[PDB]
Amino acid sequence: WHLGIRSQSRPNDIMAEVCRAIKQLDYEWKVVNPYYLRVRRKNPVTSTFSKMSLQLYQVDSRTYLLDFRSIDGSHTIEFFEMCANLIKILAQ
Amino acid sequence: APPIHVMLNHLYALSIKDGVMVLSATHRYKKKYVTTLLYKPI
Amino acid sequence: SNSSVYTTFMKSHRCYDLIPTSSKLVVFDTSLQVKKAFFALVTNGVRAAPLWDSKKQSFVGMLTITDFINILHRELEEHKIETWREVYLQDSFKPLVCISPNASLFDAVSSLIRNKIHRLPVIDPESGNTLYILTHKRILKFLKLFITEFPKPEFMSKSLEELQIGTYANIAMVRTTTPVYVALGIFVQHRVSALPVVDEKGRVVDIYSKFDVINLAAEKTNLDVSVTKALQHRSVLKCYLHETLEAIINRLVEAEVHRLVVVDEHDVVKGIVSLSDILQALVLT
């Protein structure tokens, strides 16, 4: 079981990428921190809002860790789906 | 430079296997805890 | 209310009360290949899983062994759960049957029986989250904890015959020589969980479940084979009409099995008492 996803690129690019990704998804975001975000998304089908928080940690000398955290249809499953879409774009 | 049971609400994943992705996280309902595993095709 | 303490007890407790402090919940996206879903079921060690439809953004029902029976009775593995549910228009004809955490256990048993199902998803109306999957098994265990620690109603001493709990007619069965594919047919036709296996004189020598049928299918080696030959690939709890309802509950719960085969002195099958039979007796009446 792996927490979040990883990248050995540069924090500038990593964050730059997520925002580019967030944009394609047509997701609302808010930079609370150079490396800490806050995302929203109205549900096209149920017409409700679901929000998560991104946060880039650092694990070792050259590796980085992007953390997804849910924020208080189905809340839980939609949280999985929001992430799944992001991780898909990032993985391209 | 970027920052370095708190795992609550955090996204976890098994390594993709044969086309299927498995996402998981532990959420709390009242005093109980539910770890949910979602199997979804890529 | 000594002779109705159990109904009162079930009315006074919520479904939330028997949810573990920490539990695991496996959910399948309906676009999952039926093959992968099954292996996922096996590797997680569960019998059924809630279904999430991404298109509808909603839980649309359960994936149970019965569904595999239906499919198999009629490439099968390569297709998506969606596709197969579509063939039967499952969503429309038999919509999701769920329940709230704050609903009473009594409502859980009522619903299980009324809707002739075995899996009842506990869903929070607030968040829409599936919290847990209710079963007769789990509900009976809960009830048991209360039964063996609270003065019992006199009717818990009355025998099986006296209470007429169970099914003693139309009993669907198989013979040792019955081809598995024939057993398959009688499953879909009688909508029954398990088939007593009887010998030449009609004596019960084994039990055959839907699970057994599907496991054999997984091996992929025709179905023509008889039931006993098939049962050799594996890896019989019975009762008498003169035994106390209490003793039957006890046997059924600790054996952790789904039903008892009611039987003659010569072990000729007279009937069957399942968990649902017990629940309906204890709670619904």
Ligand SMILES: Nc1ncnc2c1ncn2[C@@H]1O[C@H](COP(=O)(O)O)[C@@H](O)[C@H]1O
């Ligand atoms: N909670 C439920 N809601 C809707 N359909 C169900 C539910 N549980 C079981 N089913 C369906 O009922 C049939 C028998 O399921 P079971 O009784 O659980 O073996 C299967 O085809 C299931 O898809």
Ligand SMILES: Nc1ncnc2c1ncn2[C@@H]1O[C@H](COP(=O)(O)O)[C@@H](O)[C@H]1O
């Ligand atoms: N082999 C069988 N033949 C006829 N009826 C059965 C059989 N097994 C179970 N039943 C009945 O079908 C109902 C559902 O039982 P179950 O499928 O075991 O939950 C119960 O009331 C049983 O008495």
